[PDB]
Amino acid sequence: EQSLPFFKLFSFADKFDYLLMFVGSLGAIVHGSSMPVFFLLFGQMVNGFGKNQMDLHQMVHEVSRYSLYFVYLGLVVCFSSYAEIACWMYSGERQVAALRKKYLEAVLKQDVGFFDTDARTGDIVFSVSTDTLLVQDAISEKVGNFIHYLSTFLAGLVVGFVSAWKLALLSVAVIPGIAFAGGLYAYTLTGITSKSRESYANAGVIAEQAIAQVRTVYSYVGESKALNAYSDAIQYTLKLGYKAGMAKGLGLGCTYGIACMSWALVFWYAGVFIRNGQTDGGKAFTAIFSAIVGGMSLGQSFSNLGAFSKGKAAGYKLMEIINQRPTIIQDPLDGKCLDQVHGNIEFKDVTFSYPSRPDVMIFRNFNIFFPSGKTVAVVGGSGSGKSTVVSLIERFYDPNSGQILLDGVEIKTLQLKFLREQIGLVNQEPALFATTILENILYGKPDATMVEVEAAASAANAHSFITLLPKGYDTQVGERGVQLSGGQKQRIAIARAMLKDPKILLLDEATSALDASSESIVQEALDRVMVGRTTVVVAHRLCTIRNVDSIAVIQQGQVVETGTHEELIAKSGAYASLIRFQEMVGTENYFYRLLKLNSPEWPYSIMGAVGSILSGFIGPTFAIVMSNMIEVFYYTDYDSMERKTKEYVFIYIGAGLYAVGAYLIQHYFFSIMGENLTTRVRRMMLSAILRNEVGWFDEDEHNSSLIAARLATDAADVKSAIAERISVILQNMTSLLTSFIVAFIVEWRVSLLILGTFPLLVLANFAQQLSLKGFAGDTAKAHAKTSMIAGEGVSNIRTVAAFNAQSKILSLFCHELRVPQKRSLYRSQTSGFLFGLSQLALYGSEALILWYGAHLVSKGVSTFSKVIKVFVVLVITANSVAETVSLAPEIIRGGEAVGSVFSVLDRQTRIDPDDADADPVETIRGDIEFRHVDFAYPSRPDVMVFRDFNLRIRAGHSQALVGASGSGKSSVIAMIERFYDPLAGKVMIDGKDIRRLNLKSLRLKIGLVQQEPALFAATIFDNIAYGKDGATESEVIDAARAANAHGFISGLPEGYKTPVGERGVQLSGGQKQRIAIARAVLKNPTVLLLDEATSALDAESECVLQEALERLMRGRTTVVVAHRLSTIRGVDCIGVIQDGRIVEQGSHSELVSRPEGAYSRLLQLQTHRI
Ligand SMILES: Nc1ncnc2c1ncn2[C@@H]1O[C@H](COP(=O)(O)OP(=O)(O)O)[C@@H](O)[C@H]1O
Ligand SMILES: Nc1ncnc2c1ncn2[C@@H]1O[C@H](COP(=O)(O)OP(=O)(O)O)[C@@H](O)[C@H]1O
Ligand code: VO4
Ligand code: VO4
Ligand SMILES: [Mg+2]
Ligand SMILES: [Mg+2]
């Protein structure tokens, strides 16, 4: 797959960032290059066997001075390490923030066309969360460490050039093997990272889709299906990670083996050179040490190379989206700002085909007139051309032919910000963001004070219900207003449209939930403030548009007639056809628990720990062999030094092969155990989340995008923390223990002193680990909040485009992201200071060791040879282990991630889905009853939506539940399919409490349809076959025929295979509701918890659907709710009043014959509207 070049990642750095990166590079270079020249100086005393050992008095003074020089080097390294760590971390944090802001701005600028063809909310959330973290890790202090290692290697090579050239020619000719291995490693890791990212992106979308529509998932029991799909979506990542781990082990082993063969050859040539006499001791010592340190540094920098590979792999995907230029805008040509705006929309021979289905022609030579100040109404069939006109007007899609005129010029030539402001669009189904009511209203005009908002709310008949809420204007509505009533949602959208005060009003299929009285109030408000402005009304019910001057019906291709009410009746046209159709229808200690959780694959962990320890041995063995080599060199051994050198080069060859084997084994087995653990924890976390009740979802921090981001982020660190920390910790402790034992072997008093210094280093590391942890937790929540904001913005692009609100989203993003920069500055400064202090403490320890050894030499025993061998071994081992401190921060940032993982698993649901023993009874009766049920929603537990009321539905009957003011129409449905718990009383379905019956059987025996159906992002056939899984295509076809859906479905090109899209877009409300009814009838439950169904079906299909529903409910119990008072002819148990309490139900015919009542007044008002 394609990958962005590494240098292209630095595309968001200003002058200040360039200076910081330059300072960091200089500091890293100095830190790397300090050591080789320092040991070049150190060689003068390393030659002590022939330099000044004759006079014992001068040895102690000389080595004390050299200890002071080593302390000076410690100060120099401490100062240098501070600069390169702090400057690089600050530069990385600044760049990623600008990248995130630019990416959000670029993705929020794309039109609706880009989102429907290849874009998903889950994909966007995952790209925001994970990829930006990888890019931040790519350009962080990892580059500093890589530059430090490279500078050390080059400095060692230059030092080798100075003393004796041939040795350094070998050390420079061995480069191509390491280069080729690194190239293969980078290429393979980039490929594997691309594949794994693709695999993970699909998994994240599936989980979030199931989480968002939790009510539909619970109603049509499908947690097993979602879990199986999620597990299958991450099947390939196991093999890809296995290959990546095998590649990592092979590269490091090959590098170390090449280094070992180079060391053996360089030792043999150095020996023969000393035999020649051209070289003398110290030069060979310096060259050998330089070569060893260079090979070690390359082996260390291999991991940073891999990190860079992954970073560039993610950076390609991030950069590809932002660089995508938007669709056509082309608006400023002549009419930049016309002051003669009056409406007068002209449509001339305009054709249109949607990008998803370009073959189907929606419009063919479409002509229509929208004169100024005239309330033009649009009516037609269920899905012909109604909402497409609004989409064309609101610059969503251009027409492939023809043009449309805003009374002075084609709309293609305008100003986009100017155009969208003059027209106020009302969505067919409003999409309220997750923000308080007042700010939702302020979406329209952000510069409106309280008085204007109050006036707008009062105009739209929304003051009453808003002021009755506990908080008032600050109550949250949650995701898409799921926790707010359907009727109250429409009032908020109307108020938001009114506050904008546009010159052209586009009333789409709104004003549907308002039963009779709110309808009259909003119509009075509309034709009292919108008089004198261009008006376009798209209404299904014919009574609302009775007082319309010109009713232009829209059918296939073009319009038919543009007459008034009475004029179209005379010819009977096609408008009067709808009228006569309507008339006849009416008649702590959790890390150990996490390791315990990985019990089944214990052999892999054991063998990996064996490999880690075994590679831990080889660290100090190099120093031991080098010390013995220099000892025999200074003896000059002109008897059997040939034998000594050949035996030791054989040792080197064996050690190289040994290291290859050990590294391969260790890395492969840790890779496999880490991937198994990550997959298992992901599966269990998703199962635990799906186990929770709906109330846990109805909160502020429990959002679909938030949960998806948390799942995507946490497990990843859970891998990276477990895989990396375990390897380095075991290796470093094993190497340190081996070096300490070796120090014990040659000396005892000196080594006790060095083991007396470990508390200082461990306390410094503990301080490091403590300091960074506290502020790391705060930033995680902020990043999750930003991801949630981005996902919420992307999910409602239709509302964002209509009401220009990109500035608000950017402002919220910046406000959320402001704090982490300020915290990161101090975090970087503290980390750099602590790293410098740790390095200074580490170096100061060795100087004291050398001084103590010198003092012992002055006193007698433990002479020159023993102390300096200890010094060299400690130097090598400390240099080898001086990587855990650098690796500590990025590992320790996942500590709070693990705590979040266990917090989700720990929580026990209040609603146990099965309980595994709770009366598995399948013989359902259907005689539901309520007894003194008192309920209050957990979100606002101060409203008491239900009073002491009781209602009974005998099996074989039906409910009407007229709900004029939203009190309990949809709340009773939540009781039967229990989502919450009644505070008092009890509810029974089969004569027994449903709290003790297992939910799986009950939810299998019962089925419902939502008031606002939300189709899954799949084909029509998959959506229909969601209920009663394992259904042949014949059954699906029969269900679609019975639901009056085979008509339009067969009209579609790809039969029952056309993709729908997220939330159920790229279709019509009528078609979506038909598909939902088809799924519900396919499930075929004993009790059909029906609800408001004749919402978007007010067309020529109304008679067919109602008859089919009546036939379906012949042997079923239904609770259908309907404020339309037209499709409730089933005269059983209407249930007139549900305002908190209940009122005597009787029957529909009874209350028709009974005197004035809530149903009677509703019918009177509807007939008056008629
Ligand atoms: N975003 C879209 N992508 C592809 N096809 C669409 C899209 N929106 C609407 N359509 C198609 O256009 C037709 C009419 O849709 P719509 O305007 O919603 O009808 P109505 O508004 O009368 O219900 C539908 O059959 C649907 O298949
Ligand atoms: N999930 C929820 N969280 C908080 N309040 C809710 C929730 N669902 C409904 N309500 C409140 O209960 C009242 C009645 O809602 P609802 O049952 O939808 O009425 P209807 O079904 O008659 O439209 C509303 O005013 C709403 O504020
Ligand atoms: O907002 V409702 O149509 O459930 O009364
Ligand atoms: O816009 V609709 O004709 O699916 O109510
Ligand atoms: Mg529509
Ligand atoms: Mg409702």
Side-chain angles (χ1 to χ4, degrees):
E1 283 82 3
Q2 293 304 40
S3 43
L4 198 80
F6 182 48
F7 182 76
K8 212 72 71 193
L9 277 191
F10 309 92
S11 62
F12 296 94
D14 60 348
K15 180 254 183 181
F16 198 70
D17 283 322
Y18 288 147
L19 179 70
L20 285 167
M21 293 182 286
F22 172 71
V23 172
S25 76
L26 196 47
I29 280 157
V30 170
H31 179 201
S33 177
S34 71
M35 181 145 288
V37 294
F38 177 73
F39 273 20
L40 166 62
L41 188 137
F42 190 58
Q44 188 274 331
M45 71 87 71
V46 174
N47 290 318
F49 182 76
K51 278 311 156 286
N52 292 114
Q53 99 274 6
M54 300 95 68
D55 211 19
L56 189 69
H57 187 193
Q58 293 179 356
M59 270 305 158
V60 288
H61 296 294
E62 195 173 4
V63 297
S64 69
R65 284 191 321 81
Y66 281 151
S67 178
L68 189 68
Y69 287 26
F70 185 76
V71 175
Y72 288 180
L73 187 82
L75 284 50
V76 170
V77 161
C78 171
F79 288 165
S80 296
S81 71
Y82 181 76
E84 60 97 14
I85 289 302
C87 291
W88 267 117
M89 221 165 288
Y90 194 37
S91 179
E93 182 60 272
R94 278 201 63 189
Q95 285 193 19
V96 67
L99 194 143
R100 220 191 302 255
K101 265 147 63 162
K102 187 56 160 82
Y103 166 83
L104 185 48
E105 181 46 2
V107 65
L108 184 63
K109 201 185 310 164
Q110 307 291 322
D111 62 338
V112 291
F114 167 71
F115 282 111
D116 57 59
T117 185
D118 48 284
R120 282 90 47 83
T121 318
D123 182 333
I124 295 288
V125 165
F126 174 81
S127 195
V128 168
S129 88
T130 308
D131 292 331
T132 63
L133 285 197
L134 288 179
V135 168
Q136 184 196 50
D137 283 18
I139 62 170
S140 285
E141 82 287 331
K142 297 298 196 59
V143 188
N145 288 324
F146 182 76
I147 294 162
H148 159 272
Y149 288 142
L150 265 191
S151 66
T152 300
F153 170 71
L154 274 296
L157 188 153
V158 171
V159 160
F161 272 9
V162 176
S163 64
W165 60 69
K166 290 272 317 193
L167 296 175
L169 281 72
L170 314 179
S171 294
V172 68
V174 287
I175 296 170
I178 294 91
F180 194 110
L184 293 175
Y185 179 66
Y187 183 39
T188 308
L189 268 293
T190 44
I192 297 169
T193 300
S194 290
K195 308 269 195 52
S196 63
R197 194 256 183 220
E198 181 43 65
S199 294
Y200 284 150
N202 263 320
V205 165
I206 291 169
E208 166 188 336
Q209 193 214 230
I211 286 156
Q213 303 178 5
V214 62
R215 277 143 192 100
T216 302
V217 161
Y218 285 7
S219 66
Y220 299 100
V221 65
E223 311 95 300
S224 84
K225 287 182 246 199
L227 286 174
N228 293 334
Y230 189 78
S231 78
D232 187 68
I234 49 185
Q235 205 265 354
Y236 321 126
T237 187
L238 296 170
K239 282 286 267 206
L240 277 296
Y242 296 162
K243 301 213 167 320
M246 286 202 321
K248 162 80 145 156
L250 278 150
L252 265 172
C254 182
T255 285
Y256 268 84
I258 290 298
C260 286
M261 321 205 298
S262 169
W263 298 340
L265 188 49
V266 77
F267 275 16
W268 179 246
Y269 284 163
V272 299
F273 293 164
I274 313 189
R275 205 162 323 289
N276 301 140
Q278 55 184 358
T279 177
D280 62 358
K283 315 298 180 182
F285 182 82
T286 49
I288 281 159
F289 204 94
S290 307
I292 288 182
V293 170
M296 180 166 136
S297 314
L298 266 53
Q300 293 295 293
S301 77
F302 198 78
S303 299
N304 304 342
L305 189 144
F308 300 154
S309 307
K310 304 156 55 54
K312 66 183 290 294
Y316 161 70
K317 197 60 191 284
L318 294 174
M319 211 75 58
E320 190 276 331
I321 301 299
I322 62 170
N323 262 14
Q324 178 158 129
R325 55 185 194 288
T327 316
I328 58 161
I329 48 171
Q330 192 271 330
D331 60 356
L333 186 79
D334 50 27
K336 182 259 295 178
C337 181
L338 73 164
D339 206 19
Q340 294 299 107
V341 62
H342 296 92
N344 276 19
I345 288 299
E346 291 315 346
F347 264 70
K348 291 174 71 175
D349 54 57
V350 165
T351 66
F352 183 48
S353 58
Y354 274 109
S356 176
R357 278 88 58 86
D359 62 354
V360 174
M361 281 315 206
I362 301 299
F363 281 165
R364 273 287 195 192
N365 276 12
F366 183 63
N367 278 33
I368 191 167
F369 183 35
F370 291 120
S372 63
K374 306 312 273 177
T375 69
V376 190
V378 180
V379 76
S382 177
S384 65
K386 313 167 65 160
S387 298
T388 56
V389 178
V390 174
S391 187
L392 280 176
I393 292 186
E394 195 74 28
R395 278 313 289 285
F396 286 143
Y397 293 100
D398 78 27
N400 47 16
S401 296
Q403 72 262 42
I404 62 171
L405 281 297
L406 192 59
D407 190 28
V409 76
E410 48 199 294
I411 296 170
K412 200 163 174 95
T413 297
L414 294 174
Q415 267 196 352
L416 268 173
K417 297 85 193 172
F418 175 54
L419 167 61
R420 305 271 187 78
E421 181 285 346
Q422 306 265 309
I423 52 179
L425 188 153
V426 182
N427 264 27
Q428 158 153 34
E429 299 314 309
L432 275 300
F433 295 73
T435 300
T436 79
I437 293 278
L438 190 137
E439 192 285 346
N440 273 291
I441 303 170
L442 263 71
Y443 283 158
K445 183 152 95 197
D447 293 298
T449 61
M450 181 55 178
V451 180
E452 288 88 0
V453 181
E454 189 66 278
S458 61
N461 195 67
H463 192 47
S464 298
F465 91 99
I466 283 172
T467 198
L468 274 194
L469 294 190
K471 284 185 182 178
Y473 278 89
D474 301 295
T475 69
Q476 313 216 339
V477 288
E479 200 60 37
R480 304 212 91 165
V482 288
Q483 65 178 248
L484 185 63
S485 175
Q488 299 164 10
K489 275 181 307 195
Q490 280 202 2
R491 294 159 177 185
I492 294 312
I494 286 178
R496 181 206 321 146
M498 222 58 77
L499 197 66
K500 197 175 184 183
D501 198 50
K503 275 297 271 161
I504 301 148
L505 207 70
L506 282 155
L507 271 167
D508 210 340
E509 296 101 8
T511 71
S512 58
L514 315 181
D515 62 358
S517 46
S518 298
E519 278 303 322
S520 82
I521 301 299
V522 303
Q523 301 214 340
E524 292 257 347
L526 280 169
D527 295 331
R528 279 178 295 169
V529 298
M530 295 298 102
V531 59
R533 303 195 168 171
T534 314
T535 292
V536 171
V537 170
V538 189
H540 284 286
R541 191 184 298 170
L542 278 297
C543 315
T544 53
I545 62 170
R546 180 185 63 251
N547 292 321
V548 166
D549 50 357
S550 68
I551 297 169
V553 64
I554 285 188
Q555 283 302 113
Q556 52 94 35
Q558 73 284 50
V559 298
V560 176
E561 46 197 1
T562 58
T564 189
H565 170 83
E566 202 49 82
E567 162 180 352
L568 296 182
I569 294 171
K571 69 188 77 63
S572 301
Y575 181 76
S577 78
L578 295 169
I579 283 184
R580 75 220 181 71
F581 186 87
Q582 188 266 295
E583 188 50 78
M584 61 79 71
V585 175
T587 60
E588 60 94 22
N589 198 1
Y590 42 72
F591 182 76
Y592 163 74
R593 189 203 318 193
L594 181 64
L595 277 296
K596 185 183 287 185
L597 194 51
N598 198 17
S599 174
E601 49 161 17
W602 71 69
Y604 294 132
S605 174
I606 297 169
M607 203 165 186
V610 166
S612 312
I613 296 171
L614 270 168
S615 66
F617 292 99
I618 191 166
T621 53
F622 286 146
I624 296 196
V625 176
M626 209 284 271
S627 304
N628 298 6
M629 281 325 317
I630 193 66
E631 176 83 331
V632 70
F633 292 165
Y634 284 153
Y635 184 68
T636 308
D637 200 76
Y638 281 159
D639 201 0
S640 295
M641 67 186 317
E642 302 290 288
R643 188 183 303 279
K644 313 273 151 193
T645 60
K646 67 209 280 170
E647 291 296 326
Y648 275 111
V649 302
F650 279 165
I651 297 169
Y652 263 120
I653 301 299
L657 305 178
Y658 182 76
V660 175
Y663 268 104
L664 175 55
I665 282 164
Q666 153 190 70
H667 278 312
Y668 177 45
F669 285 123
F670 291 168
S671 77
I672 180 166
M673 52 145 288
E675 311 256 9
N676 278 323
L677 166 68
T678 301
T679 300
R680 200 172 292 103
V681 68
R682 271 177 178 260
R683 173 72 178 273
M684 301 146 58
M685 201 175 328
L686 193 51
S687 197
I689 278 180
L690 268 295
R691 190 174 173 84
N692 283 12
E693 83 271 25
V694 307
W696 180 83
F697 293 105
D698 277 13
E699 270 197 12
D700 180 39
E701 184 178 1
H702 303 153
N703 199 281
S704 297
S705 171
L706 276 171
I707 288 181
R710 190 147 305 277
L711 263 63
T713 47
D714 281 27
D717 313 290
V718 162
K719 176 183 328 183
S720 177
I722 292 299
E724 280 288 344
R725 162 202 291 268
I726 288 299
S727 296
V728 300
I729 284 300
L730 277 296
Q731 290 179 178
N732 294 7
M733 311 275 138
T734 307
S735 84
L736 279 179
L737 171 73
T738 304
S739 179
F740 285 173
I741 296 314
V742 173
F744 286 164
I745 298 314
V746 288
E747 273 300 317
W748 53 293
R749 288 238 165 189
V750 183
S751 196
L752 281 186
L753 186 61
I754 195 52
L755 271 75
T757 300
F758 182 76
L760 277 76
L761 277 296
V762 71
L763 192 147
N765 297 359
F766 282 165
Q768 292 220 346
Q769 190 263 15
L770 260 53
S771 72
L772 275 72
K773 268 184 90 210
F775 281 91
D778 201 357
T779 49
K781 186 182 287 185
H783 292 338
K785 183 61 69 180
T786 77
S787 163
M788 181 285 258
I789 286 174
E792 183 206 84
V794 176
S795 179
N796 300 311
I797 194 71
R798 262 134 180 93
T799 304
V800 171
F803 300 109
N804 191 37
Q806 313 164 1
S807 63
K808 269 188 171 204
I809 308 300
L810 275 186
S811 176
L812 288 173
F813 207 67
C814 292
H815 282 205
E816 212 53 60
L817 273 195
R818 185 62 59 85
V819 176
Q821 328 305 115
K822 324 198 310 305
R823 290 307 94 201
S824 77
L825 167 66
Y826 277 58
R827 175 193 297 118
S828 86
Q829 296 290 342
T830 300
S831 79
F833 202 56
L834 267 294
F835 205 81
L837 278 195
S838 179
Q839 296 297 291
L840 191 40
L842 188 150
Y843 292 166
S845 167
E846 303 159 45
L848 183 63
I849 284 297
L850 191 55
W851 181 82
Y852 187 110
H855 188 242
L856 271 195
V857 167
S858 177
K859 192 261 169 194
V861 300
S862 169
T863 176
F864 180 97
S865 315
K866 304 308 192 53
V867 291
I868 286 182
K869 170 177 303 150
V870 159
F871 181 79
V872 163
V873 167
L874 276 68
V875 159
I876 288 295
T877 307
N879 189 359
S880 84
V881 186
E883 53 94 20
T884 301
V885 192
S886 62
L887 211 69
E890 57 273 21
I891 295 181
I892 209 60
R893 69 194 207 153
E896 302 216 12
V898 165
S900 61
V901 167
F902 279 133
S903 76
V904 175
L905 289 165
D906 183 358
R907 208 264 199 184
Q908 282 169 344
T909 182
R910 292 171 130 88
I911 306 296
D912 200 356
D914 214 21
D915 215 341
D917 63 85
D919 296 5
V921 179
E922 58 270 9
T923 56
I924 190 167
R925 280 294 308 119
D927 49 354
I928 300 106
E929 64 172 283
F930 280 63
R931 277 180 60 191
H932 306 261
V933 176
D934 297 333
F935 178 70
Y937 276 97
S939 191
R940 56 175 70 92
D942 275 327
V943 285
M944 191 95 88
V945 303
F946 279 133
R947 181 69 272 172
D948 188 85
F949 83 108
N950 53 1
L951 59 89
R952 63 187 316 281
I953 318 162
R954 174 61 71 186
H957 298 73
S958 277
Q959 281 326 112
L961 298 183
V962 290
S965 288
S967 311
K969 254 186 148 188
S970 300
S971 193
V972 289
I973 302 190
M975 289 299 164
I976 318 295
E977 278 206 2
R978 52 191 301 271
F979 297 118
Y980 314 94
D981 278 335
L983 293 205
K986 57 179 71 57
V987 64
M988 291 85 78
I989 277 179
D990 300 325
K992 204 92 191 193
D993 183 12
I994 62 170
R995 276 192 294 281
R996 68 175 32 90
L997 309 184
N998 47 352
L999 304 174
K1000 292 315 193 46
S1001 279
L1002 201 71
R1003 295 212 198 118
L1004 269 180
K1005 299 303 176 294
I1006 204 161
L1008 61 83
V1009 60
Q1010 298 255 296
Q1011 64 170 351
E1012 273 207 78
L1015 277 296
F1016 289 81
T1019 72
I1020 296 90
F1021 162 68
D1022 185 25
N1023 280 287
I1024 293 178
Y1026 208 87
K1028 199 180 176 184
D1029 63 50
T1032 295
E1033 189 72 85
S1034 70
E1035 297 180 59
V1036 172
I1037 286 165
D1038 172 59
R1041 272 190 150 264
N1044 189 359
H1046 195 26
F1048 74 95
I1049 280 174
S1050 68
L1052 311 176
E1054 297 105 312
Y1056 300 77
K1057 287 299 185 331
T1058 300
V1060 171
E1062 70 79 21
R1063 186 52 91 160
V1065 194
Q1066 309 178 183
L1067 286 178
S1068 70
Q1071 285 153 337
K1072 287 153 58 175
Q1073 197 167 8
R1074 290 174 187 176
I1075 287 156
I1077 294 172
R1079 151 207 298 184
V1081 65
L1082 178 55
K1083 183 181 180 182
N1084 191 55
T1086 54
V1087 193
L1088 183 55
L1089 294 174
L1090 211 63
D1091 63 346
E1092 174 72 29
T1094 59
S1095 45
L1097 294 174
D1098 189 75
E1100 286 92 355
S1101 63
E1102 179 60 272
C1103 195
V1104 180
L1105 281 293
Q1106 61 95 7
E1107 291 275 355
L1109 290 173
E1110 191 275 9
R1111 191 177 298 118
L1112 176 58
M1113 61 79 71
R1114 179 66 65 192
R1116 268 172 259 282
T1117 307
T1118 49
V1119 296
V1120 65
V1121 298
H1123 62 87
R1124 207 182 278 275
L1125 269 67
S1126 47
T1127 177
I1128 43 175
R1129 269 90 60 84
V1131 287
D1132 305 324
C1133 277
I1134 60 171
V1136 54
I1137 292 175
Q1138 289 78 17
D1139 186 275
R1141 64 214 80 74
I1142 200 82
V1143 171
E1144 190 258 321
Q1145 310 195 355
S1147 74
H1148 193 110
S1149 66
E1150 186 73 29
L1151 191 48
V1152 159
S1153 45
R1154 279 189 289 172
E1156 286 184 350
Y1159 163 85
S1160 303
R1161 68 192 297 198
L1162 281 172
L1163 193 145
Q1164 284 149 0
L1165 281 183
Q1166 285 286 324
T1167 48
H1168 298 344
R1169 192 49 58 213
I1170 285 164

